[PDB]
Amino acid sequence: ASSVKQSYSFLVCKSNPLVVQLVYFVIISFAGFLALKNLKPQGKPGPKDLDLLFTSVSTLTVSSMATVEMEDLSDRQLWVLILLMLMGGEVFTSMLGLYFNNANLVRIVTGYFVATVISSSVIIIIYFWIDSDARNVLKSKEINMYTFCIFTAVSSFANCGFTPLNSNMQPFRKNWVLLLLVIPQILAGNTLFSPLLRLCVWVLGKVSGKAEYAYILQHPGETGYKHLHVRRNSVYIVLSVTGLILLQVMFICSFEWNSESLEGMNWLQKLVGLLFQSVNTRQAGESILDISTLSPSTLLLFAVVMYLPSDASFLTANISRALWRNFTVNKLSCLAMFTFLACITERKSISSDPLNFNIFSIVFEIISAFGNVGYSLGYSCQKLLKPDATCKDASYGFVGRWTEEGKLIVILVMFLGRLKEFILK
Amino acid sequence: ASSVKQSYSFLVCKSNPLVVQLVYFVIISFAGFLALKNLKPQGKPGPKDLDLLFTSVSTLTVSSMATVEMEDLSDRQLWVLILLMLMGGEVFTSMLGLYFNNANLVRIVTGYFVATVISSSVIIIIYFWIDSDARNVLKSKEINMYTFCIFTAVSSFANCGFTPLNSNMQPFRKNWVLLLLVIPQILAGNTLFSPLLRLCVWVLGKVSGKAEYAYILQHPGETGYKHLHVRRNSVYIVLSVTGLILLQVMFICSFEWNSESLEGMNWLQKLVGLLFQSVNTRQAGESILDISTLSPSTLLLFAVVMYLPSDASFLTANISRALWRNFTVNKLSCLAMFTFLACITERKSISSDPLNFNIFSIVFEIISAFGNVGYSLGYSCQKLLKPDATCKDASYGFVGRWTEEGKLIVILVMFLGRLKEFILK
Predict the structure, then answer these.
(1) Domain assignment present for B129
(2) A360 and B363 in contact by Cβ < 8 A?
(3) Helix-strand-coil split of chain A, %, nearest 5
(4) Does a structural domain hold residue A261?
(5) Half-sphere exposure of A108 (CA within 13 A, CB side)
(6) Cα separations (Å) of A211 from A206, A218, B98?
(7) In chain A, how many domains are there?
(8) Residues 6 or more apart from A301 whose CB is under 8 A from it?
(9) Is residue B359 part of a domain?
């Protein structure tokens, strides 16, 4: 209770924000892994503790990188994941930071977060109530309807990318209404958070008439909030994200409109699904297509977009040994070093299975982990060079098929990716 | 004669250095392609004009990217390639720039260039004279001994990477003496040019005693030469290149010491060959191992090293739309765009043959072309998924197996890579 507040205040007063946030993430991830281990169902042999720790990290790190199938976790573990997502989302961490800075605009941010989460949950619950196809699908998968709704709302708002379905949103690719109802939740999380918050402050100031709201609106830098910029910067956020989404939609519609991953869908269904995928590419994680089946051009476009630094990390950020150090921090040297380590650890897998364990797939996984997106190129054992029937084609990401050292490397990459925009300064 | 000088002076007086150097490279490349077409041997159907143009560009662009086997060109075409290499090397272009700047240190630079070329040719000729194994190899390949020696010396000094042998220096991997005699020629070209020139100026000043040489030595910036830096910068050049070479040697010795590409070699032979490869990786192009057979970690290390900007481009170089433009020029956006284009053009090849036409191989080719290195991941038709016997496994680089649009894209990438450190300003 009060002891937590006292310890947090003591940490904040002396240590840097980076150190306190690293301690926060490490301790919460360890607690989540411990919980996931405790409420494991009895009798059935669950995943190894490393997979549970990886799932807890990816849930907290809102990176959605899966090592265990989402169907291998019970309802209680699903709610533990929901709690980790709530306590690890970008908006919630920024809200806690604002709390602690103000103690040593808070109401508006807390209201925005709580209202968005509650409205998303209610909207998804209502949509499942009106449409019985989703209820039938959930009954087939034996997943609690309300638990799935809350999980989906929290994951979409927090931009994590996890869903109780093992195939993520693939079973719901035909339901364009759900995708159109979920897209705003993703766009009200990490992406388009600053312009939406600015609009919320603007409408509150207009309706209330209080001069404090206008003062906050026109002095965004005085309050010190990272995600509250000037009108020009917010307009830049909207324009940049909209243009990137339109570019992604254009390229995917040009290339994979007739692909097998969209077969059996109407033109409107295909358009809505591709728009949902393009929105998710930046940082959501949720996918409706098996990203492996996409053409190499679209895969490279995905890699480029998830490599693009977040706009919050772009506006805010914008003897020879000092130049070397400055060059080592550019988001690219770390990616190259981690990809080199991952290729070292998976040398046997790459040599034996070059179709799935190729260098581009490892680059994609490293970019996904560092950018906290969640796109996994997957692993189809039908693509093995040597025909092996002992495979059980699993729905978890490519990282789940790596070695233990590879999983540890991806865990470190995800931790560094969440703690980015902080290591830079 | 004098008309050429008048035209060059007229171009220099008005246009920027970038424009005049671009027109110089374009016109010389076109002349070289026209020559290569003209002295093609009669009776035998040679390569298509696009392949000749690509070879002329890569020879001029000292990028060593091969579309045609080097055994398909006669002695006259080999000498045309030698002339293109001489007129397109980094040292020669810098020397011409110094000529035109001084007209509108020249003696020392010209002496260094001419003496290094002549001494390299004489040394290689002498080594072929003393050792008859190389003479036997050349007789087996039916290549003129003196022509091969001059070609090798010019290519090693100009850091191009071409050799009359189709397999490059692979037949000579056992001859460690030749590799140790060629390494200084490569290290006296583009790399270690500034420290070697500084040492040459220093010894000339010490022996002569003229104060002008010391004035040039201690005021490197006054003369305006790009490749003449201060003592600290030259020491940095030496230290950085030596450390990078040692790191590459360490990693390759750790990984591929027992690989098939080095089977049948003594420990000293393996060490010398790996050191030669590490020296060449930065920007030489010449290789003694089939780079395809190397492990993925070493391939990624090669990609990283050839992606590292030249130290001359590092020392010399070191509202939101303006920031976007500044971010678009970082050597990475261009690589991503060109790789995206190459993947678009080779979509059929990637889909049909994913083992050789994978995204990492295209990334490697694009990095090699932009960095003007010359490393090609190759194409072994035994790696086809579909077993096709119509193949004739050719010794030319991976780019020779691309589509015509892919070859054009690589030509553009090579032209931009040579004109790098210029487009940046």
Answers:
(1) no
(2) yes
(3) 70, 0, 30
(4) no
(5) 21
(6) 10, 11, 66
(7) 1
(8) A248, A251, A252, B340
(9) yes
Task: Return phi, psi of residue A111, to 5°.
Answer: -60, -40
CA distances from B380 to A260, B95, B115, B163 (A): 30, 41, 41, 21
- Print the domain residue range for B390: 311-418
DSSP string, A396-410: S-GGGGS-HHHHHHH
- Cα angle for residues B157, B159, B162 (degrees, 5° grid): 100
Cα Rg of chain A (Å, integer)? 21
Do the chains contact at B355 and A354, CB–CB below 8 Å? Answer: yes
Instruction: Provide the number of CB pairs (under 8 Å) joining chain A to chain B.
Output: 62
B420: three-class secondary structure by DSSP: coil
Three state DSSP letters for B339-366: HHHHHHHCHHHHHHCCCCCCHHHHHHHH
Cβ contact A228:A220 at 8 Å = yes
- Resolution, given in Å to one decimal, reads 3.5
d(CA A328, CA A129): 52
Q: Which residues of A touch B354 (CB under 8 A)?
A: 355
Would you tell me how many other CB atoms lie within 10 Å of the CB of residue A384?
A: 15
With respect to residue B268, please indicate whether it lies within any of the assigned structural domains. Answer: no
Nearest-neighbour CA in chain B from A319: distance (Å): 10
Phi, psi of A423 (to 5 degrees): -65, -30
**Three-point CA angle B124, B59, B348, nearest 5°:** 130
Is the separation of the CB atoms in A181 and A129 below 8 Å? no
Residue among A292, A297, A334 with most chain B CBs within 10 A, to mutate? A297
Task: Please choose, from the candidates A112, A111, A109, the residue with its C-alpha nearest in 3D space to the C-alpha of residue A225.
Answer: A109
| B179: nearest Cα among B306, B96, B270, B302 | B270
Q: How far apart are the first and last CA of chain B?
A: 32
Residue A293 forms contact with B (CB below 8 Å): no
Question: Which residues from chain A sit within 8 angstroms of residue B355, using beta carbons?
Answer: 354-355
Q: What 8-state DSSP symbol labels residue B188? A: T
Task: Compare CB distances from B320 to A236, A323, A332 and report the shortest one's residue.
Answer: A236
Q: Determine, for residues A323 and B314 on separate chains, whether the beta-carbon distance falls below 8 Å.
A: yes
Which of B247, B298, B344 should one mutate to test binding to chain A, selecting the residue with the greatest count of A CBs within 10 A?
Answer: B344
Tell me how far apart the alpha carbons of residues B256 and B270 are, in angstroms, rounded to a whole number.
10
C-beta atoms surrounding B167 within 10 Å: 17
**Cα-based torsion angle of the residue sequence B410, B413, B414, B418 in order, rounded to the nearest 10 degrees:** 180
Q: Which residue of B238, B248, B320 is the best one to mutate when testing the A interface, meaning the one whose CB has the most A CBs within 10 A?
A: B320
Separation between Cα atoms, residue A252 and residue A65, nearest integer Å: 23
A359 within 8 A of A343, measured Cβ to Cβ: yes
**Whole-angstrom Cα distance, residue A341 to residue A344?**
5
- Cβ–Cβ < 8 Å for B365, B275: no
Question: Sign of the C-alpha dihedral, residues A251, A257, A262, A266?
Answer: positive
